[PDB]
Amino acid sequence: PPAVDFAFVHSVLLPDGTPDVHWRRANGGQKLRDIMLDSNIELYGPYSKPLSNCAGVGTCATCMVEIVNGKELLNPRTDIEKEKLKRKPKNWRLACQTNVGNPDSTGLVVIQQLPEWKAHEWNIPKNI
Amino acid sequence: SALFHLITHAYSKALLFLGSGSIIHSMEAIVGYSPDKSQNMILMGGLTKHVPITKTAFLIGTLSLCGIPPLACFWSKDEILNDSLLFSPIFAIIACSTAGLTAFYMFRIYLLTFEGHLNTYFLNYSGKKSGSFYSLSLWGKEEEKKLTMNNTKRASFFCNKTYKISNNVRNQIFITVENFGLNTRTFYYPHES
Amino acid sequence: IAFFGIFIAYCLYKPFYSSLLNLTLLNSFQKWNSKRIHWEKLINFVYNWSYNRGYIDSFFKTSLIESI
Amino acid sequence: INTEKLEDKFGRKGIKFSESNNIPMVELKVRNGSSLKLSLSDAHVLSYKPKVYWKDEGFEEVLYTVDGDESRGGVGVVIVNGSSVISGCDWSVKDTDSDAIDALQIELSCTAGVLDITYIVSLYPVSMATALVVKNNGRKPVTLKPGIMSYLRFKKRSGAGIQGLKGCSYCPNPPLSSPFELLSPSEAMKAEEGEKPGIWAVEDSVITLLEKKMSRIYGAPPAERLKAVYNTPPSKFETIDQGRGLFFRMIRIGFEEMYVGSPGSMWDKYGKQHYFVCTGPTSMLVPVDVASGETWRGAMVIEHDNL
């Protein structure tokens, strides 16, 4: 079946000092929030309580996720991600406004959840 | 009844605001000075453990707004609804609904701040606290001289290979350089004002 | 009604390791609401209300001070 | 008192070695009043009293051990092949110069022939870290199955959960045979509601209760054979007490699946107070094979965020 390969590196490093990769399988592209919630990975963080976030529409800047190796199969920034966050390293997208594509999709997007409250910088190779 | 409600509200919500300022000036030691952080109720988290007097003050204030009968001020709202419910159908049942909503959001305000884990030094979210705590590894002398600059550990160096897919490795080599420990290792907890 | 509001706040925001409620009920709470589709509109509208400030500030800053 | 010799060899400011009832034992006390008692020569950590509350004596006991019988109680490391490989009580310290006062570490080491099973008990001011590492020396790859069986005590019989194993699949599977058992593997699946064999089921409860007998293992090693994404199970979860207001987090590193065991109502057959739970990370269904000379690591970390 068409399976998109997520990674979902956690922000907190393990006690070993190495990151943890979880490799969620969830099929197709509808919404990265609904994928991370259906497949049960920590998206919000302390905003995971019910009314502590806008729950999908994009009015808060809470479900922001740093995505690297993700220039391949995404929707572009929908001017809510371009406005609700304005000064970020540009690898950070809101999971409920972004979309990883259509059902017939395969890819290796790696999406560091909770970029706020992190210790690492990811050293993305310079574009162009 | 309006003036008694005003008196109890102005002695309860003023207490809640002074408690909020004490919460805030306890939180500045955590998150520095930023109203999007030092007043953000979500990452206030848990402060019953650290600031107990402010906890009791804010708890008494919020329970006075919810109308708790023995150890708080219910009787103002009691006279309100007693003089209101036999007046009109519109301005009675919706007033009681908003009183229930008042109880809800005020206790949410109390719970998101005081009861729970700190949500800012929480080791499931805060990687800086983790990097500050584990000053040494779990192996001692093995597996490294120490490691910073961990690469894309998508295979975890476990001799794992991919099946028929789009791609497994590529020209994407990104060094996830972690931070250090044993530096500014204090990270003091929120003490009382 | 006040204790009902208190309880709706308690079952959500009080954590499981410190809540005086029984775990057998707290798990059924999320089991009944594991879908989050009918709550994904109610919570959405309530947060939109609280974040747009009832849209009244936007209406005034679009039609009263921008009008002036 | 050989532990006096080990104390003048490796004793530090927060590390205290003791020997009573011919048991070599060590206490690790970090700066914040968090104590950790380990029985040497056995790789069996007994008691763990980390500072939970902000009182003077706010530290609370975590690991369930019975009063006089240290052999049955507390967290212990385990190896099998299919018999207990480390049944020999030949563990010896290796080093302790770990940190100033803040975090301490003991390096036990034994040898089961071609295997040098060395072992790290590290105390950080909020966490136990129990970390095994083995290394082959012979010309045969070994098919060992390791595990770290922890026994956490809860004050209330009804206040028991794990809070975060949802979404990942589980199979009801008996525990690994330990010298530090509390229930045998044959009775852990007996007298239920999960069926004994490895039937697979996706979890649909955000916090699974530990009221019943159900003693299972989370992970899908059948999909691990695929070595695709395979939905790696969560490497951490919040075990809660709810009788007293605290919780803990069991982080697994290197291990693949997570075993949980609820004694159910049959804890009265062994103990009368402090109903417990047998939780630990393992690689049990699909074993681990290192090499004819390589090394393999695996660790379990209990940490609290109450402090």
Ligand code: FES
């Ligand atoms: S949840 Fe509010 S932005 Fe995605």
